[PDB]
C-alpha cells in the first residue's frame, strides 16, 4: 500500500493494493481492471511461473552439464526432435490425458474453488490449500512450508512469483538466443564472457 | 477497457472477427483437402 | 446426484430423480421435460440393444479364440448360409418388431394402457414405470431398485460406448474386437492407434 | 452409364485433359533453375493436379463426352456423395446458423433496449446459445409440438 513501485514517482493503479503477492503496481494497458480477470490472471501468472521454471532448470542445468561432461544430453532446442523409446506422438497422447485430468481438477477449483479438495476414489486423502492457485496438502507441500502467517506467506509468494517472472524472460531468452546465435546458452555467456564489450546481440 | 471490450463488441467489428476466423478454417480445410468435389 | 465434472452446475431440470443422473446435458439437449421424458425411454432401448448385441458380438469370438466352439466374426456371420432367406429373416423381424414396438409406444403415450393381453384377456402387465414392464418380463421377479436401475444404465452406457468402439476398431482394423485386445496386449506401446 | 455418361477412371477425354494440364504447366516449369523457388511451387501445382484427376476417378465420379465430371443428384445410391450427403451437411449447419440466430434476438426481445443488444453483440450471451444450435432439429420439433416456434 505503501511499497516500492516499478515506476517511482508514478501512481500505482486503483485495482493494485499491495495485497497480492509481486505487487509492483505494473499493468499499463489495465489487463487486470476487471476483478474477475484480475484473478483469472494472477493464476496465470501462477503456472506460467512454475512451468517457466521447470522449463529453466530444465534447459539450462542439463545444457550446462553436457557443454562440459558431466553430461551427454543433447541441444534442448532439438531434444523433441529425436526418436524415444515410444514415438512421440504417442507421448503426447499420455500427456494430454495425465496433464488433461490434472489441468481439469485445477481448472474446476478455479471457478467453483473448494470442489476437487478430497481423493476421488480414497475420499480420506485430501488437499489443505485455502487460497486458488496453493493447493497445499501432502502431494504438493508435504512440509507444511506453504501454510505459514500471512506476512511469510506475503514473502514466500513474492520470491514465488519474482523466480518465475525471471524464469519467463530467460526461457524466452533461450528460445530467441538459439535463433539469432546457432548454439546453446552456455554457449552465449561464455562468448559474452570471453569478450563483454563485442560478443553481445551484434555482428552485422 | 470495458469501453473497448463493448466496441470489440460491435457489428462491424465482431463480424471482421467473426468472418476472419470462418475465412482462416475454410482456407485451412482447402489446404489439407483440397479439391473436394465430392462431399 | 453424481457429479460428471466434479464443482460443475449441474443442470437444473436434472434433480437428482432419474437414475443415472451425473449431471451430464451439457449441450442441453434434455431442457424440455417431455424431451427429457423421452430420451429417459431412448437410452434405456439403445443402451438394452447395446448390452445384448455388445455380448452377442464379443463374447462369441472370446469362446471360438479359446476353441469351445467355431462361429463366424460378427461382421461376418451375415453372409452365413441359414435355414431362411436373409430377405425372408428381414420380413419376420420387421411384422413381429412392429407389432412389439408399437405396443411399447402406446406405453410411453399413455402408460399403461396397453399392460393387458389382447387375446387371452385374462393375463395383464400389474402397474409400473414406463419402460420397466415387469410382470412376465421380470419372471424371476427382481426388485426393480434404484441401484439396480443405475447399474443397469452404467452397463447399457458402457455397452453402447464399446459398441461404438467395435465399429470404429473394425473398419480400421479390418479384425475383430477381441483380436484388436490380444494385438494390443502383445507389445501394447506400439499398436496404439499407430494405424 | 447413368445419362449415357462413363466414369471417369475409364474416360479418355478425361485423361487427356490431364495431360494437357501437366504439359501446360511444365512448360513454365522448364523456365527455372530446379532448385529454385518457381520449381518447386510449379512442381507442387503438378502433383496436386495429379492428385485431383485420381481423387476424382477414384471416388466414382461419372464423366460427359467433354471428359469433365458431372453430377448425379437425382437421388441414386452411388452419387450421395455428389448432392445427398453433403447437403444434409449444409442443412445441419444453416439450421445451426439459424436457431442460434433465433434463439438470441428471443433471449434479448424483452431486454430495456433490445435494439441494442442488436448493434453491439451480447458476446457473453452469445457464448452460451452458440451450443443450441448442435440439436436444433430436436429443440426445434419440440417448440413445433408444444406451440412455441410459430405465433398465432
Ligand atoms: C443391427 C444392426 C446391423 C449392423 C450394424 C449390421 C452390419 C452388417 N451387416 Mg447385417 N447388420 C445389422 C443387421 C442385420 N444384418 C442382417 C443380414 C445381413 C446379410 C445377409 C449381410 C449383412 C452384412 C452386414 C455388413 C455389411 C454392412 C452394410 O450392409 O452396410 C450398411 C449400410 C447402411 C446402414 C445404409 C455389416 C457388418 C453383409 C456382410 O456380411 O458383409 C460383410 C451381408 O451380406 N447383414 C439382418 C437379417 C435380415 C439384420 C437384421 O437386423
Ligand atoms: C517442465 C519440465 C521439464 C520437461 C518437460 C523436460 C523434458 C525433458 N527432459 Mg528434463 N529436466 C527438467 C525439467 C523438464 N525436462 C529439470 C528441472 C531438470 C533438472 C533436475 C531436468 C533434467 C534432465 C536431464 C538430466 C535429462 C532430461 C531429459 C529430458 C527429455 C526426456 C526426458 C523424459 O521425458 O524422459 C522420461 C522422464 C520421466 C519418466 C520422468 C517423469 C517422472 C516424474 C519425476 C514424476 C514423478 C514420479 C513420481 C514420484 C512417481 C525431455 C525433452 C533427458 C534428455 O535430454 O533426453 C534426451 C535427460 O537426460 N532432463
Ligand atoms: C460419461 C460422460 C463423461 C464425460 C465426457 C466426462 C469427462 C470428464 N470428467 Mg467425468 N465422470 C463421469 C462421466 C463423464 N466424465 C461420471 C459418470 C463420473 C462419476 C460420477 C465422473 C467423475 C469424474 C471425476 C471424479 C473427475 C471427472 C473429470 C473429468 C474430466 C477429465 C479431464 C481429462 O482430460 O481427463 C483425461 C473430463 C472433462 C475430472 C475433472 O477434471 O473434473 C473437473 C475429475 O476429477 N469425472
Ligand atoms: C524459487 C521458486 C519457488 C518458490 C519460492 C516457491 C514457493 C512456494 N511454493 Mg512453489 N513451485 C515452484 C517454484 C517455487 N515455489 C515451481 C517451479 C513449481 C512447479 C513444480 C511449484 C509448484 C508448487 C505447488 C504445486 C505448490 C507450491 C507451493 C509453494 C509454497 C510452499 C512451498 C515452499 O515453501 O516452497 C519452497 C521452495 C523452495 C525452497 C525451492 C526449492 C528449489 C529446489 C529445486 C528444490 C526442488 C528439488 C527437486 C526434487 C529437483 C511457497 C509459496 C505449495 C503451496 O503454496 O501450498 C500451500 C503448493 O501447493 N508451489
Ligand atoms: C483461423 C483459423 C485457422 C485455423 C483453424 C488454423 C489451423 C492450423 N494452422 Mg493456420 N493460419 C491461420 C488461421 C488458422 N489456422 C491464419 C490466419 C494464418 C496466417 C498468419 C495461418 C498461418 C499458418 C501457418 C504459417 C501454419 C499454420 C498451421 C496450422 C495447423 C497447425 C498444425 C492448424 C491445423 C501450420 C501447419 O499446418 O503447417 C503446414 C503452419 O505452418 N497456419
Ligand atoms: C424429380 C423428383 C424426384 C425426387 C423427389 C426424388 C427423390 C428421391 N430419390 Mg430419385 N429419381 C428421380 C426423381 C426424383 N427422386 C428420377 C427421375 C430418377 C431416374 C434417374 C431417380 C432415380 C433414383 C435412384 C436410382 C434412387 C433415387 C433415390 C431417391 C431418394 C433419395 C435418398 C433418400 O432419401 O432415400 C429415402 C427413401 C425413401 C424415404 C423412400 C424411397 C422409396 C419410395 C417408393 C419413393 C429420394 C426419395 C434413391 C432411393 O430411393 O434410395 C432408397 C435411389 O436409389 N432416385
Ligand atoms: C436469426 C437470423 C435469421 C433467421 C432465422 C431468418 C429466417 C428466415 N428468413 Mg431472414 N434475414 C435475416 C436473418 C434471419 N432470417 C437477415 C439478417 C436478413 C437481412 C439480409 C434477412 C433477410 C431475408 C429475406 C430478404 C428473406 C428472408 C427469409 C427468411 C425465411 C426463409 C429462409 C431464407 O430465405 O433465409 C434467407 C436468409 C437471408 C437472406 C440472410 C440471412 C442470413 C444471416 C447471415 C443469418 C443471421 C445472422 C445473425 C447475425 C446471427 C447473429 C446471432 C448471434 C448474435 C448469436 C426464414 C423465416 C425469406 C422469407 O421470408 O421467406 C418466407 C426472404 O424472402 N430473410
Ligand atoms: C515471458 C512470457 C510472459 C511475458 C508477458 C509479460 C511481458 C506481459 C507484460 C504486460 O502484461 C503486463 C504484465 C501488463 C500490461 O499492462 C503490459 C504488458 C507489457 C502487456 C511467458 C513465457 C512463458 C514460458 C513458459 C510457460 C515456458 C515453459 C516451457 C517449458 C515447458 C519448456 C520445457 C523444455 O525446455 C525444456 C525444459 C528442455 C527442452 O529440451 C525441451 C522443452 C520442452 C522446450
Ligand atoms: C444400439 C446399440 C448397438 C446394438 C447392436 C446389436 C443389436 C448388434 C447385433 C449384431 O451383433 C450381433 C449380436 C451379431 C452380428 O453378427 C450382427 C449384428 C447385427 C451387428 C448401439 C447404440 C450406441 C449408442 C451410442 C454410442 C450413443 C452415444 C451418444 C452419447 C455419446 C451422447 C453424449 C451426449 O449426448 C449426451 C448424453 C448429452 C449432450 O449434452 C452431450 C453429448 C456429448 C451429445
Ligand atoms: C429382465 C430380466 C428379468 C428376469 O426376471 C431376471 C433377469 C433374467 C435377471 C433379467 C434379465 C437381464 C439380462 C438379460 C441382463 C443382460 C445383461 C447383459 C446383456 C449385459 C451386457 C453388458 C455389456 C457390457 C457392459 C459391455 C462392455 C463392453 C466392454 C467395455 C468392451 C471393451 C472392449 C473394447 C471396446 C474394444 C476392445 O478391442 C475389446 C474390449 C476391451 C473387450
Ligand atoms: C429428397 C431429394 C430431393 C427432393 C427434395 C424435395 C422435393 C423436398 C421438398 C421439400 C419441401 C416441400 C419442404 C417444405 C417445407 C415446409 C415448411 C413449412 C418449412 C418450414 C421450415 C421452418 C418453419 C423452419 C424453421 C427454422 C428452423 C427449423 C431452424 C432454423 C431457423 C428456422 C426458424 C428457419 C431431390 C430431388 C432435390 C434430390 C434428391 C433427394
Same mark, same amino acid.
Given at each position: ?8 514517482? @508514478?501512481?500505482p493503479?486503483?485495482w ?12 499499463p494497458?489495465?489487463?487486470? @481492471?476487471?476483478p ?11 503456472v506460467? @511461473?512454475?512451468?517457466?521454471?521447470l522449463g529453466?532448470?530444465?534447459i539450462?542445468i542439463?545444457?550446462?552439464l553436457?557443454?562440459?561432461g558431466?553430461?551427454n544430453?543433447?541441444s ?5 526432435e529425436?526418436?524415444?523409446?515410444t ?6 497422447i499420455?500427456?494430454?490425458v ?5 489441468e ?8 467453483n474453488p473448494?470442489?476437487?479438495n ?8 485430501k488437499?489443505?490449500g ?5 493447493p497445499?496438502?501432502?502431494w504438493?507441500?508435504?512440509?507444511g512450508?506453504?501454510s ?9 509468494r513474492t520470491?514465488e512469483?519474482?523466480?518465475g517472472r525471471?524464469?519467463?524472460?530467460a526461457v524466452?531468452?533461450?528460445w530467441?538466443?538459439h535463433?539469432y546465435t546457432?548454439?546453446?546458452?552456455i554457449?552465449?555467456?561464455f562468448?559474452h564472457?570471453?569478450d563483454p ?8 | 477497457?470495458?469501453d473497448?471490450?463493448t466496441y470489440?463488441?460491435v457489428?462491424?467489428?465482431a463480424?471482421t472477427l467473426?468472418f ?6 475454410l482456407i ?5 483437402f483440397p ?5 | 446426484?453424481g457429479?460428471?465434472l466434479p464443482?460443475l452446475?449441474?443442470?437444473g431440470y436434472?434433480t437428482?430423480?432419474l437414475?443415472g443422473?451425473?449431471?451430464?446435458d451439457?449441450?442441453?439437449?434434455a ?9 429417459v ?5 439403445n ?9 452377442g458380438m464379443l463374447?462369441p469370438e ?7 466352439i467355431?462361429?463366424?466374426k ?9 435355414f431362411?432367406?436373409?430377405?425372408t429373416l ?6 413381429l418388431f412392429?407389432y412389439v414396438?408399437?405396443?411399447?409406444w402406446q406405453?410411453?403415450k399413455?402408460?399403461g394402457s396397453?399392460?393387458?393381453?389382447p ?26 431398485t ?6 443397469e ?6 455397452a453402447?460406448?464399446?459398441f461404438?468402439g467395435?465399429?470404429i476398431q ?6 475383430g474386437?477381441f483380436?484388436?485386445?490380444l ?5 501394447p506401446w506400439?499398436n496404439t492407434?499407430?494405424? | 452409364?447413368?445419362?449415357?455418361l462413363t466414369?471417369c477412371?475409364?474416360s479418355?477425354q ?11 504447366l511444365e512448360?513454365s516449369?522448364?523456365l527455372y533453375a ?6 518447386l511451387?510449379?512442381?507442387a501445382?503438378i502433383?496436386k ?9 477414384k471416388?466414382?465420379?461419372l464423366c460427359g463426352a467433354d471428359?469433365?465430371?458431372?453430377l448425379?443428384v437425382?437421388?441414386d ?5 455428389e ?5 444434409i451437411?449444409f ?10 440466430g433465433?434463439?438470441?434476438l428471443?433471449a434479448?426481445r ?10 453491439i453483440i ?5 457464448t452460451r ?5 448442435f ?15 410459430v405465433a398465432?
Amino acid at each position: 500500500p505503501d511499497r516500492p513501485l516499478w515506476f517511482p514517482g @508514478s501512481t500505482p493503479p486503483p485495482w493494485l493494493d499491495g495485497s497480492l503477492p509481486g505487487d509492483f503496481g505494473f499493468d499499463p494497458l489495465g489487463l487486470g @481492471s476487471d476483478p474477475e480477470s484480475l484473478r483469472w490472471n494472477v493464476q496465470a501468472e501462477l503456472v506460467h @511461473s512454475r512451468w517457466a521454471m521447470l522449463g529453466a532448470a530444465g534447459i539450462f542445468i542439463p545444457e550446462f552439464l553436457t557443454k562440459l561432461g558431466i553430461l551427454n544430453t543433447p541441444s534442448w532446442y532439438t531434444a523433441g526432435e529425436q526418436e524415444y523409446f515410444t514415438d512421440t506422438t504417442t507421448l503426447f497422447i499420455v500427456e494430454l490425458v495425465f496433464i488433461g485430468w490434472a489441468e481439469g481438477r485445477r481448472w474446476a477449483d478455479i471457478l467453483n474453488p473448494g470442489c476437487v479438495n478430497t481423493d476421488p476414489i480414497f475420499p480420506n486423502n485430501k488437499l489443505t490449500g485455502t487460497d486458488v492457485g496453493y493447493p497445499g496438502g501432502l502431494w504438493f507441500d508435504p512440509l507444511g512450508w506453504g501454510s505459514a502467517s500471512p506476512q511469510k506467506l506475503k514473502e514466500l509468494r513474492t520470491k514465488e512469483i519474482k523466480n518465475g517472472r525471471l524464469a519467463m524472460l530467460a526461457v524466452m531468452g533461450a528460445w530467441f538466443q538459439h535463433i539469432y546465435t546457432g548454439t546453446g546458452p552456455i554457449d552465449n555467456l561464455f562468448a559474452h564472457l570471453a569478450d563483454p564489450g563485442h560478443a553481445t546481440i551484434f555482428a552485422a | 477497457m470495458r469501453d473497448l471490450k463493448t466496441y470489440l463488441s460491435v457489428a462491424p467489428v465482431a463480424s471482421t472477427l467473426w468472418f476472419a476466423a470462418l475465412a482462416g478454417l475454410l482456407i485451412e480445410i482447402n489446404r489439407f483437402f483440397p479439391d473436394a468435389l465430392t462431399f | 446426484k453424481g457429479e460428471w465434472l466434479p464443482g460443475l452446475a449441474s443442470p437444473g431440470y436434472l434433480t437428482g430423480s432419474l437414475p443415472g443422473d451425473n449431471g451430464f446435458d451439457p449441450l442441453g439437449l434434455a431442457e424440455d421435460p417431455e424431451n427429457l421424458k423421452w430420451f429417459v425411454q431412448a437410452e434405456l432401448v439403445n443402451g438394452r440393444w447395446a448390452m445384448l448385441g455388445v455380448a452377442g458380438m464379443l463374447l462369441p469370438e472370446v469362446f471360438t479364440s479359446i476353441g469351445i466352439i467355431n462361429v463366424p466374426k460378427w461382421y461376418d456371420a451375415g453372409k452365413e448360409e441359414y435355414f431362411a432367406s436373409s430377405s425372408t429373416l428381414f420380413v419376420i423381424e420387421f411384422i413381429l418388431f412392429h407389432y412389439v414396438e408399437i405396443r411399447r409406444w402406446q406405453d410411453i403415450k399413455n402408460p399403461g394402457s396397453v399392460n393387458q393381453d389382447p387375446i387371452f384377456k385374462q393375463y395383464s402387465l400389474p402397474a409400473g414405470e414406463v419402460g420397466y414392464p415387469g410382470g412376465i418380463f421380470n419372471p424371476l421377479n427382481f426388485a426393480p431398485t434404484l441401484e439396480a436401475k443405475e447399474k443397469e444404465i452404467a452397463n447399457g452406457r458402457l455397452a453402447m460406448l464399446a459398441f461404438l468402439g467395435f465399429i470404429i476398431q473394425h473398419n480400421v482394423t479390418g479384425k475383430g474386437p477381441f483380436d484388436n485386445l490380444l494385438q494390443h496386449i502383445s507389445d501394447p506401446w506400439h499398436n496404439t492407434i499407430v494405424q | 452409364d447413368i445419362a449415357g455418361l462413363t466414369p471417369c477412371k475409364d474416360s479418355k477425354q478425361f485423361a487427356k485433359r490431364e495431360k494437357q494440364s501437366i504439359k501446360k504447366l511444365e512448360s513454365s516449369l522448364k523456365l527455372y533453375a530446379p532448385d529454385s523457388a518457381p520449381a518447386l511451387a510449379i512442381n507442387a501445382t503438378i502433383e496436386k493436379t495429379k492428385r485431383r484427376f485420381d481423387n476424382y476417378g477414384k471416388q466414382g465420379l461419372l464423366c460427359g463426352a467433354d471428359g469433365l465430371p458431372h453430377l448425379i443428384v437425382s437421388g441414386d445410391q452411388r452419387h450421395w456423395g455428389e448432392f445427398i450427403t453433403p447437403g444434409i451437411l449444409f442443412l445441419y449447419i444453416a439450421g445451426w446458423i439459424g436457431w442460434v440466430g433465433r434463439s438470441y434476438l428471443i433471449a434479448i426481445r424483452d431486454d430495456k433496449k433490445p435494439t441494442q443488444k442488436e448493434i453491439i453483440i451480447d458476446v457473453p450471451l452469445a457464448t452460451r446459445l452458440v451450443f443450441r444450435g448442435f440439436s436444433w432439429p430436436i429443440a426445434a420439433y419440440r417448440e413445433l409440438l408444444n406451440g412455441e416456434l410459430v405465433a398465432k
